[PDB]
A paper describes a structure:
Human protein [name]/[name], the founding member of the HECT-type ubiquitin ligase family, was originally identified as an associated partner of the viral oncoprotein E6 of human papillomaviruses (HPVs). The E6 oncoprotein from high-risk HPV types hijacks the ligase activity of the host [name] to ubiquitinate the tumor suppressor p5313, leading to the aberrant p53 degradation. The HECT-type E3 ligases have a characteristic C-terminal HECT domain consisting of an N-lobe and a C-lobe that are responsible for E2 binding and ubiquitin acceptance, respectively. Here, by using cryogenic electronic microscopy, we reveal that the structures of full-length [name] and [name]/E6 complex are monomer and dimer of [name]/E6 protomer, respectively.
After several rounds of 3D classification, we identified five distinct conformational states of the [name]/E6 complex and resolved the structures of these five conformations at resolutions ranging from 2.6 to 4.4 Å. We therefore assigned the five conformations into one of two classes: attached (Att) or detached (Det). In all three Att conformations, the catalytic C-lobe of [name] attaches to E6, whereas, in the two Det conformations, there are no interactions between the C-lobe and E6. We hereafter refer to the three Att conformations as Att1, Att2 and [name] based on the distance between the tips of the two towers in a descending sequence: 74 Å in Att1, 71 Å in Att2, and 66 Å in [name]. (1) the two towers tilt towards each other around a region of intersect between the two α1-helices. As such, the conformation of [name]/E6 complex changes from Att1, through Att2 to [name]. (2) When the two towers leant beyond a threshold, the Att conformation changed into a Det conformation. While the distance between the two towers varies among the three Att conformations, there is no detectable difference in the distance between the C-lobe and the inter-protomer E6. As the two towers underwent an outwards rotation, the Det2 conformation transformed into the Det1 conformation. Intriguingly, despite substantial variation in the structure of the [name]/E6 complex, the inter–α1-helical interaction remains intact; albeit there are some changes at the interface between the two α1-helices (238 Å2 for Att1, 222 Å2 for Att2, 209 Å2 for [name], 157 Å2 for Det1 and 145 Å2 for Det2). The Det and Att conformations of the [name]/E6 complex presented in this study should be structurally relevant to these accepting and donating processes, respectively.
Residue numbers in the entry:
A (entry chain A), C (entry chain C): 120 to 169, 231 to 869
B (entry chain B), D (entry chain D): 9 to 149
């Protein structure tokens, strides 16, 4: 029998056409019917029927039953190659999903092939199928994501590897440069889109915490000129302005912030080989201004590592600075104002904090758009030009002054090396706005910082309230106590009499008593209400003990980074890496990217001695040398290789110690008589600071 | 004159209040605080700009101030840009219905300019939530 | 006989292989030997031998002897298609012309085909052959040009049509836009290069006048900063700096200025269809910065008409203005100077000439680089902004004031309407520099002028002294008298006693006596020395009677247009068209390019009435209307179509006359009650000025 | 000190005249008329810049003034640009022989920079007859 008149495939038919063909040693009917039904897209709509009309278990059973030789596996790839252009153009033009919701049923049939991971699919079948999937409507994508969220973790990892292998093969099999790009490649774009679908499925498959959302921040008022212009146009205040959000994000209704612990770690979705071949300078433009064919990869930030996301944020900030400079030039030309294209911040070395606070307050309350200008800090009492060296100096001293325990601004826990907000900082709000604005300007100006905060601070900054699970990083002792209380299986009304009337110590030493509920002293903690006690105690500690201070800090931070794509690109677990830097000192990477000028060559007599000396440097001496030269003791975001160190020849063998131009990480090294003299001079030079 | 609902917003509606016609009305700019000539007041009437009141006083905008501050707003509050077809798909509302103004002269785009943008595949711009494009008068060399 | 062992072709062999084949009705040997010898490039080097080793007459004889049927003509095109890539790569790589000068001998053989003009060559043969010709060395091009210069005029016209037909076919057979260009097309570039070769052959084939060359102008001294910089670099003064000249021009040694009357008029070489498809905005860039494949057409200015050469000059001037604005912005930013990006020219309405003269003198003697800034004329006593309307106003009034016969600056001849330099303008040099600078700034700022000068003035401005042949335009009566004297066949020592002692009248009326030679009163004019008398009298009149005034005028004109490509693009016969404008008033062209704003539509009730009224306008009323609206009574360079007139609706039917915004050629037309009222208002409005 | 032939031109040659070494010589700029520090005088020695004399006085240039006026000259007296191979064909002299300086820092290009220009196909620039290119230090991001 040839089975020439079959239009739909069910479990028993695809099972009864097996024994007969095996006994008659004729596998031709199997392959011919497979190539007939599968290549015809409409056939899969009804084949293997019963918000899903497809029995996934039956699909798995038939797939493991048919994938048993070297001939049946070849009957699927050709059918896929024939089907994919047809389904692609059908979804593009005929709008098939509009007329029926069961057209999507073929996608799960196709994607349940456990051999999709095999290398033979990466040539022509998988790229076309991913193009067809990327050409799918939004509601179908949402329902497919909802279906995928029910899968087990290893299945989700399997899909993630299935798409990442295709991405790696497509970026390896071709070369890209400034001439030919990766954005215009259709197959890689489709693969990234399906990877985004899988990543959002993973995000929505885990726990979702939407109730503990921080209150929406107040958008800063623009300058009076823009308000007058909006009044003239009659638009006035319209609620159509907001952050750029993924259409899939608003269709699903669940943000990536809600997902606390996903099934698969977020770092797995990051694709390594794509980043080294991806250029941010064009990707940001393709993201801002839409292009007919090119697809920017910043629309899917998960696929980017911390090195390139920083590049995109820096490009956005630089473009904003350039626009501000253009506006200042236009003002000076037309209106006739003095050209002031810099955020002049003149402060005294002894009172940096107060002068910076008052200047920033008078700028913010008058010109909220002035903060977007390029920073230019000129210390009072000294004459010079800040090309990038004094700003980091001011940042370092302002960090030291603000984070001083003497002011009592932040409590210090030596067991963790993590400052925490001090609830007792009463009548002191300007300094919290000052430190928030300092962090914002640091992100804006690409200057790293030595700031130690628990992850709960960054989670609250992003817009998610702190909870019990975040207490471990902040208060490990309290977290241990409350988890021991939760894990007690006995009666808590018999051993301890701890109630909602909770008392805590103070900085001076005198404890104070706090009430969680209306009358905590009268209601003791029992077994049934124990769960609703810890989630309130931790909530109080992380939210309303610092309700006033952290509100001002968040407002100050958001005043600068309101228009930046920082809220869109970075998760709370990457903000600390963006602001601070890596603590690993790898001078081997610094060896490769170091540049020479002034006559020094790579294979010079003194360069090798200097490199030997610095390699033989002590763990702390490396930090001292880095702080002396580049103005900071921390590696930049990424590694030391990104720090384009430059060594410049100064002059003959003298008794003058080497000097460093901090603005460009430039070290001025004279040619000394020998290696030991150079080592002595370097030791004497890096220790003064 | 302290209740905004009573106070008019459009130029001819405001003219009807003062028992004067648009032919010989007297108006002064809001930024430079200088009197508008006939050309700019007629252009203000044509461009459909709402009258702004400061301390209960009528005010309009002159061509120089308008074209300067619109350029400033474009340079400052530029959000992103989109194609005409993509904008149509996003809003699902016909292009002739959405209110689109020129980037420079702030004049609403007639359907001819929107069609020209569609055929020439020029890019619509978003300025602080205000969709905008290039008019015919401002795109002439 | 098949003639299987022939390596070179001579006149008798190509003649003896004809009668035998005709009698035996077998033309196969002819076509096969033609395809053998011609396709092999090395064969033509020795075939048909004797700074030319090829008997051109024999080539003509054999070509007219063989071009007699429909089969032999097809034996050349295939051989050309096979040969051309080989010769092209041979000249490109092997440098064959270096090893021998007789390799060029094949080019004349190929180009002597009188059927090259036929349409069948434009498909594949002629483009490849022109590519091979364009890939030829410079010395070979020079010697080929020297050989071609001996041809008769109709032959040169034949070559010119041969290349122009190819150019027209190549521009017609393909479409070009901003996406796909014409510069990158290799065939059209090669055709233009061979057309340039033919054009220079025509130029050098006519009369060459190199002795009557004007003295080299003194290059203006740059600002002191550039002099100090050159001193620091040690380069100091370098004579290498000069105008961009054609390598073929310096190889031939004869400039296009020397050619007075070419064999073919220069306007014939102008290609019409290419200009409407050629974009200057990219051609100028390809001319300035070299591109790997694109070839700018401004390197061959003859192929461009006056409309597009003006576009190139305007683009160059605009780029210079932009660079000056950038420099001013940089000054204001770094040094801290007041931003002054305009050439502020504040003058009084009554004394424009003197105020402009003193301001321009104080600018030139202090900041020679200030003249390159954009002009901005603000009349004293009136407040406003000159967006392009006051500058043309100032130009018109300065022209009227300077060219007033009251000052005696220029003599007026009513029989020709052409002002001439007044030799009696003693102790008045500043005004001539003023008018020269006015003309230079007019060319720079794209503002036409009402200036009437003879062609000899522009010839002297370009750098060629006036001669006897140029006297007709300046002094027709004197030219007639001297040509009658020259054409007298009798003895001039018997009828008149005119000697070198020549007297002329003065403006007051009292004549003065001038001596041409040492003692002109003692040597009379004879028959043998009659020729060397007119060429000295006219030389004196056109050169040394105005030696002082015209030197200052030329210096003033060159002070502004020293760096412009005006000396490179425009011949002296086009300078007057660039400065002045066309006198033909064609409102039909203005109909098509007129634009409407303010609510007016093309098919409006009042627009048609206005168009009827202006079409029914008198010859002088059209000039009055144009002067009222656009500030000038002359059509721009090209036609009225290039004048982008704009009509803007003002308001309701009022009694106020229409007003014109001269900066943008904008006419403000209110909607009147009927057509007759609009006509009356227009008549009353255009007559005030 | 009024005869240019007697007066030296190079920094070490000038140093030999005053019986002082380059280690602790004192020099002042020509534009801003301010004393050069050690870094800029050593850079002046390295860049092979000829000493300019004003009224019989030694003078050098500081980094700010040099990099500002070189930029001004580039913006003002830019003539055209050419490729390395085309420049070689024009001059017929090897690239390592022609004196090519940086546009910004006015430092002569070592053969490494010229080779990098050749491979990367960067364009040499002509500034008032002074051929120039981009050095290694001024082309680092
Ligand atoms: Zn105004
Ligand atoms: Zn407009
Ligand atoms: Zn200086
Ligand atoms: Zn440099």
């Amino acid at each position: 029998i040839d089975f020439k008149d079959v239009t739909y495939l069910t479990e028993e038919k695809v099972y009864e056409i097996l024994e007969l063909c095996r006994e008659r040693e004729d596998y031709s009917p199997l392959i011919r019917v497979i190539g007939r039904v599968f290549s015809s897209a409409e056939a899969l709509v009804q084949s293997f029927r019963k918000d899903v009309s497809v029995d996934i278990d039956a699909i798995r059973r038939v797939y493991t039953r048919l994938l048993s030789n070297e001939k049946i596996e070849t009957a699927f790839l050709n059918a896929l190659v024939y089907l994919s252009p047809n389904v692609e153009c059908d979804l593009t033009y005929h709008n098939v999903y509009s007329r029926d919701p069961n057209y999507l049923n073929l996608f799960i049939i196709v994607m349940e092939n456990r051999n999709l991971h095999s290398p033979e699919y990466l040539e022509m079948a998988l790229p076309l199928f991913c193009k067809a999937m990327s050409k799918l409507p939004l509601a179908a994508q949402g329902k497919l994501i909802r279906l995928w969220s029910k899968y087990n973790a290893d299945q989700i990892r399997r899909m993630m590897e299935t798409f990442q292998q295709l991405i790696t093969y497509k970026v390896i099999s071709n070369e890209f440069n400034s001439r030919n790009l990766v954005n215009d490649d259709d197959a890689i774009v489709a693969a990234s889109k399906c990877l985004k679908m899988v990543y959002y499925a993973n995000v929505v498959g885990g726990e979702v915490d939407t109730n503990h959302n921080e209150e929406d921040d107040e958008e800063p008022i623009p300058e009076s000129s823009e308000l007058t212009l909006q009044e003239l146009l009659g638009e006035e205040r319209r609620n159509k302005k907001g952050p750029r959000v993924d259409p899939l994000e608003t269709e699903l209704g669940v943000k990536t912030l809600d997902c606390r612990k996903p099934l698969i770690p977020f770092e797995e979705f990051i694709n390594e080989p794509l980043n080294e071949v991806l250029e941010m300078d064009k990707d940001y433009t393709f993201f801002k201004v839409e292009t007919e064919n090119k697809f920017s990869f910043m629309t899917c930030p998960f696929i980017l590592n911390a090195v390139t996301k920083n590049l995109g944020l820096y490009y956005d900030n630089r473009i904003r600075m350039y626009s501000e400079r253009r506006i200042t030039v236009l003002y000076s030309l037309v209106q006739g104002q003095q050209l002031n294209p810099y955020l002049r911040l003149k402060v005294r070395r002894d009172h940096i904090i107060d002068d910076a606070l008052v200047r920033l307050e008078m700028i913010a309350m008058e010109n909220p758009a002035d903060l977007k200008k390029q920073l230019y800090v000129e210390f009072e009492g000294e004459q010079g030009v800040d090309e990038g060296g004094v700003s980091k100096e001011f940042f370092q001293l302002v960090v030291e002054e603000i984070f001083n325990p003497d002011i009592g601004m932040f409590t210090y826990d030596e067991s963790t090396k993590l400052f925490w907000f001090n609830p007792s900082s009463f009548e002191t709000e300007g300094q919290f706005t000052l430190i928030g604005i300092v962090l914002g300007l640091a992100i804006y100006n690409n200057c790293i910082l030595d700031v130690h905060f628990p992850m709960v601070v960054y989670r609250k900054l992003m817009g998610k309230k702190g909870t019990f699970r975040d207490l471990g990083d902040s208060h490990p002792v309290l977290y241990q106590s409350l988890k021991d209380l939760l894990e007690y299986e006995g009666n808590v009304e018999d051993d301890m009499m701890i109630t909602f009337q909770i008392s805590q110590t103070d900085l001076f030493g005198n404890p104070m008593m706090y009430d969680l509920k209306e009358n905590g002293d009268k209601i003791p903690i029992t077994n049934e209400n124990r769960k609703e006690f810890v989630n309130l105690y931790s909530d109080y500690i992380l939210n309303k003990s610092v309700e006033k201070q952290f509100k001002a800090f968040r407002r100050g931070f958001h005043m600068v980074t309101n228009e930046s794509p920082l809220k869109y690109l970075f998760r709370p677990e990457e903000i600390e890496l963006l602001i601070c830097g890596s603590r690993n000192l790898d001078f081997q990477a610094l060896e490769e990217t170091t540049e020479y000028d002034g006559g020094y060559t790579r294979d010079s007599v003194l360069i090798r001695e200097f490199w030997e000396i610095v390699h033989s440097f002590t763990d702390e001496q490396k930090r001292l040398f880095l702080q002396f030269t580049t103005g900071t003791d921390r590696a930049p975001v990424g590694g030391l290789g990104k720090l384009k160190m430059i060594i410049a020849k100064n002059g003959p063998d003298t008794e003058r110690l080497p000097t460093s131009h901090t603005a460009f990480n430039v070290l001025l090294l004279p040619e000394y008589s020998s290696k030991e003299k150079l080592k002595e001079r370097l030791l004497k030079a890096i220790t003064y600071a | 004159f302290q209740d905004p609902q009573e106070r008019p917003r459009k130029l001819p509606q405001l003219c009807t209040e003062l028992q004067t016609t648009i032919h010989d009305i007297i108006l002064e700019c809001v930024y430079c605080k200088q009197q508008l000539l006939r050309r700019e007041v007629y252009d203000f009437a044509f461009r459909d700009l709402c009258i702004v009141y400061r301390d209960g006083n009528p005010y309009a905008v002159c061509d120089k101030c308008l074209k300067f501050y619109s350029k400033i707003s474009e340079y400052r509050h530029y959000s992103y840009s989109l194609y005409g077809t993509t904008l149509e798909q996003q809003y699902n509302k016909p292009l002739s219905d959405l209110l689109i103004r020129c980037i420079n002269c702030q004049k609403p785009l007639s359907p001819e300019e929107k069609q020209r943008h569609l055929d020439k595949k020029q890019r619509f711009h978003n300025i602080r939530g205000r969709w905008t494009g290039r008019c015919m008068s401002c795109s002439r060399s």
